[PDB]
Design a protein around this nucleic acid. Structure first.
Ligand SMILES: O=C(NCc1ccc(F)cc1)c1c(O)n(O)c(=O)c2ccccc12
Ligand SMILES: O=C(NCc1ccc(F)cc1)c1c(O)n(O)c(=O)c2ccccc12
Ligand SMILES: [Mg+2]
Ligand SMILES: [Mg+2]
Ligand SMILES: [N+]
Ligand SMILES: [N+]
Ligand SMILES: [Zn+2]
Ligand SMILES: [Zn+2]
Lengths: 184, 368, 368, 184
DNA sequence: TGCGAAATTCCATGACA
DNA sequence: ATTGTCATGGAATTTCGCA
DNA sequence: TGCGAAATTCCATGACA
DNA sequence: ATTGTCATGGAATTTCGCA
């Protein structure tokens, strides 16, 4: 059996709700199952609409042989199931309650969640504008398992904005101060 | 007055008044029988006054002008005086158009990697579709991979909004543009400083320079017009399909789609190319660096029979902005300070600031 | 369906399926190992369906299109099927622009005498001077002698008013014009019938044809712009001086002013040419018939490396009027009825009336 | 002394008043003293203005070495005398009351007067519109003394509208009917 | 039968909505 | 059924002045 | 070692405000 | 301070299939 490639599979779930930024409440997260390259589309709800609205974007760049996702409302819906059939895209599903990404993906998705909450604390409401910059990061985040970032595996070259800031990302001591006082 | 012409009529020869001509006086004028008939020979004191008189009838060029004079007068080295007066005629200099073509064009090197250089222009305005009106086209230099963004104006405002989505994927080193209103804003420089993006601009009024995209515009407008035959121009909705379309389409002469040049693998598009199925990404990715570098690259054409290239400190003139009607199609002369390359120079006008311009909007100033 | 491909897989050869290739089946498809890898070989029943599929991705031309197919399928004489489909793609045919240039231009003969042919165009609009707005320029063919008339519109109305003053001097045999609104009026035909003047028209949208004047327009606009530097554009008042100016100015290449070509003697203008002072009018007038006939006259240029001339019954297409944006820049194809000369033909469109047009607004229809 | 040429001399007088046609009342008459070619400019009055208005026209075609004329108001006036000096034109005058055209000119001028009155009887008021056509005639009027019309001597070619209608021009029998009843 | 310089002629370039 | 033109100013050629 | 036909490559033409 | 491009479809070339 043949080697693994970018575009061979695309992993999606939705993140949210969250404190509204320019009236978005959700982030659609797509990670390339080979390179772990990430796309982040901010949406208004986990609806098959706002999904397809976004993917129509991404897919104007590249189309994935396969889309793996949990069994959410939006991804099962027959509407999405068509959009896929149309685009010649095989849909693929994580048996309810036993969700199965992959090493690299499982990881990258974790990296993401912590990453958001890290910076949307202190500006819980100014996060829409940082989606660009976040992406740039998790795509120039040097992966232990290869010598390579998404960016380099995707394009085969070095980015012009490297995050050789191997940075904490963890809820560093002070952000729990005005964190568990904003909710607790 | 009289001066030289005495010694002539007297008989003993003078320089440039060939002997076998019978230089007499008559009607109180210094006539001379020449093969064309007898022509008057005015005193050097009057010749400037005359040539001007002649020229100024219809601001005629060299031959046209001499031929009027010829009828009545004669003297030595005629045209020389005519040429003096033409290179002094301010109006001739700013209206007559050239007869000298520009030296051959430069084919700069294909940028090395993707994201080294991005070109960008605005197409528009167009037929309102969904209230949108222009498009922002962004072509990666190296690869030709291309992004479209439909906008309500050609504004710094919406120019930015878009590249903020673009620079999500990656950030480019340089961005080339037309000196158009939306790219020369102060606000845009800041946008790009912020991200560490060098802004570089086409000389003004010269899209050959931004032409990697101008050419990607042709190919875009082309494909919509095909998709909107016998259908109202509801283009907004195709922008996506078009974008996808072109990035995934062979340039016959390279034998690669912009998409492949940028990724090394077709996505799950139609007739996705198989060949490298069997190499690991690693193996692919290295072969990519291989192809990318060994990509066709055109040379400079031969120069035209009668082209000019630009010396330093030469006298040259810039083409008029958008000239009005009945307004000279050329600015007053100016001096070539530096030559950035055989097609781009820096000039100082009489204004007089420094300007960087394509030899294409310059004419060398006739006569010196 | 299956048909031909059985006997192939069976082993015993078929036409155009070269033997040393191992044509097997696999995945329920008739693959074949070729030097580029293994390619599928679809049944002739599906090939039209496929090529169309491929092309229709981005309405790509021949190479661009085959290269997409190549990735997956193979079969005999490929491009042949691709070309079939391209010459059938209505949209490709009305949008792609040419790559074939028109055959060399014709230099018709200089009309024989003055007043044989008059050319006429309208220049404008311009900067209101004294409420006037256009000019009517009239060039005599043979001589180049020229009349200007300043008008408030480009109207049959004022076109006539003027020639009524002109035909005071003499009446011309023919009048050439652009098919512009003011010369194609019904009312003008009557004006000219009345006087026994044959009206003849440039093909439409082609001023090369009326260009004896288009060129006299350049030279006119040029000289005003010189006379109105650093002065408001009050042109109305110069029209006279200009008119006089040009008619009395040498064309270097003939060595005569339009004025002289038409009269045989300079008037009491500046640098009036003397030479024929001494012959009776009779002697002059005959020498005129002499010059006039033995006047330079240019030949036809060489054709371009890749020009076309127009056969009869050929398929060709007319350039779109003033196309809108996102609208094909070419009309549907049509058939060349008569060839009036290598640069002018008569065509019938699918409308379908007869039209007379410059090969310059035609493209031969690619592919047959 | 040298031969005679077109443009060497230009003869002018004014004709009028006359029954107004489009509000003109006068015709300025210029005849080339060599070819006898004729120009006809209709004017509003014998004033140095309306003269110069017209001649500025004619002179945008050709300029005469000399202009001969009677001693009328308009031709003596220092204004006209300048206009001439300007254009480099020598002015020239017929000693009062002894007016001296030339054979050909004397004649042509006669030809003209009869010619007008011939046709501006019956449309005394529609004459402005016929000035074009009149000219055409007296310029294609074959001259006894040469073999030639103005038109041919001027241009050295044959006109495309010939008046080989050697026509009466004389107040033919009937036009004295409604002529000396319109004034007598 | 020949030189150097002037005079002439050549002709690619561009612009007429 | 109709159709390119032609001034311009450096270059390349031809002709002039003198021997 | 050489044919005829196909496949490929060449490259002038034109259009991007 | 910066700079032309490149799809297109006939033509001209080179390579394929078979001997
Ligand atoms: O003229 C323009 N484009 C067409 C063109 C012409 C020749 C070439 F080689 C390349 C392209 C202009 C253009 O594309 N853009 O983007 C402008 O901003 C512009 C502004 C003013 C005038 C023209 C253009
Ligand atoms: O385009 C026109 N003239 C410029 C031109 C271009 C190429 C040539 F070889 C000769 C001239 C038009 C023009 O001169 N006239 O008179 C028109 O009536 C006209 C009408 C519509 C479009 C263009 C022109
Ligand atoms: Mg632009
Ligand atoms: Mg016109
Ligand atoms: N370069
Ligand atoms: N002809
Ligand atoms: Zn001038
Ligand atoms: Zn098509």
């Amino acid at each position: 059996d043949r080697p693994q490639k970018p575009f061979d599979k695309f992993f999606i779930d939705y993140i949210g709700p969250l404190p509204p930024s320019q009236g978005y409440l959700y982030v659609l997260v797509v990670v390339d199952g080979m390179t772990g390259f990430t796309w982040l589309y901010p949406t208004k709800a986990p609806s098959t609409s706002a999904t397809v609205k976004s993917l129509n974007v991404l897919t104007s760049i590249a189309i994935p042989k396969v889309i793996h996702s949990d069994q959410g409302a939006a991804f099962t819906s027959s509407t999405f199931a068509e959009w896929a059939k149309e685009r010649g895209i095989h849909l693929e599903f994580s048996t309810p309650y036993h969700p199965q990404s992959s090493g690299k993906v499982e990881r990258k998705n974790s990296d993401i969640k912590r990453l958001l909450t890290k910076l949307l604390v202190g500006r819980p409401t100014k996060w829409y504008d940082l989606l660009p910059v976040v992406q740039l990061a998790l795509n120039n985040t040097y992966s232990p398992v290869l010598k390579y970032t998404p960016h380099q595996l995707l394009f085969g070259i070095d980015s012009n904005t490297p995050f050789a800031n191997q940075d904490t990302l963890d809820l560093t001591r002070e952000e729990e101060l005005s964190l568990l006082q904003e909710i607790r | 007055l009289d001066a030289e012409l005495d010694q002539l009529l007297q008989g003993h020869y003078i320089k440039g008044y060939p002997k076998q001509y019978t230089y007499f006086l008559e009607d109180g004028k210094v006539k001379v029988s020449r093969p064309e008939g007898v022509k008057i020979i005015p005193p050097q004191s009057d010749r400037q006054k005359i040539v001007l008189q002649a020229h100024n009838l219809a601001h005629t060029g060299r031959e046209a002008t001499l031929l009027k004079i010829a009828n009545l007068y004669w003297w030595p080295n005629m045209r020389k005086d005519v040429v003096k007066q033409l290179g002094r005629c301010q109006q001739c200099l700013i209206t007559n158009a050239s007869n000298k073509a520009s030296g051959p064009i430069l084919r700069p090197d294909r940028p090395q990697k993707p994201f080294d250089k991005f070109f960008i222009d605005y197409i528009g305005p167009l037929p309102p579709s969904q209230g949108y009106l222009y498009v922002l086209v962004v072509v990666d230099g190296m690869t030709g991979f291309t992004w479209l963004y439909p906008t309500k104006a050609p504004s710094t405002s919406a120019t930015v909004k878009s590249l903020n989505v673009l620079t999500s994927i990656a950030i480019p080193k340089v961005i080339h543009s037309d000196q158009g209103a939306a790219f020369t804003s102060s606000t845009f420089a800041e946008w790009a400083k912020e991200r560490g993006i060098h802004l570089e601009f086409s000389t003004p009024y010269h899209p050959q320079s931004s032409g990697k995209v101008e050419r990607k515009n042709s190919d875009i407008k082309r494909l919509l017009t095909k998709l909107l035959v016998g259908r109202p121009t509801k283009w907004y909705d195709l922008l996506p399909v078009v974008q996808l379309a072109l990035n995934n389409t062979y340039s016959p002469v390279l034998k690669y789609t912009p998409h492949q040049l940028l990724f090394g693998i077709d996505s799950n598009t139609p007739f996705a190319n198989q060949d490298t199925l069997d190499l690991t990404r690693e193996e692919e990715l290295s072969l990519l660096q291989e192809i990318r570098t060994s990509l066709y690259h055109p040379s400079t054409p031969p120069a035209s029979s009668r082209s000019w290239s630009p010396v330093v400190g030469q006298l040259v003139q810039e083409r008029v902005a958008r000239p009005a009607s009945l307004r000279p199609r050329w600015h007053k002369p100016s001096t070539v300070l530096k030559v950035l390359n055989p097609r781009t120079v820096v000039i100082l006008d009489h204004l007089g600031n420094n300007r960087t311009v394509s030899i294409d909007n310059l004419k060398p100033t006739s006569h010196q």
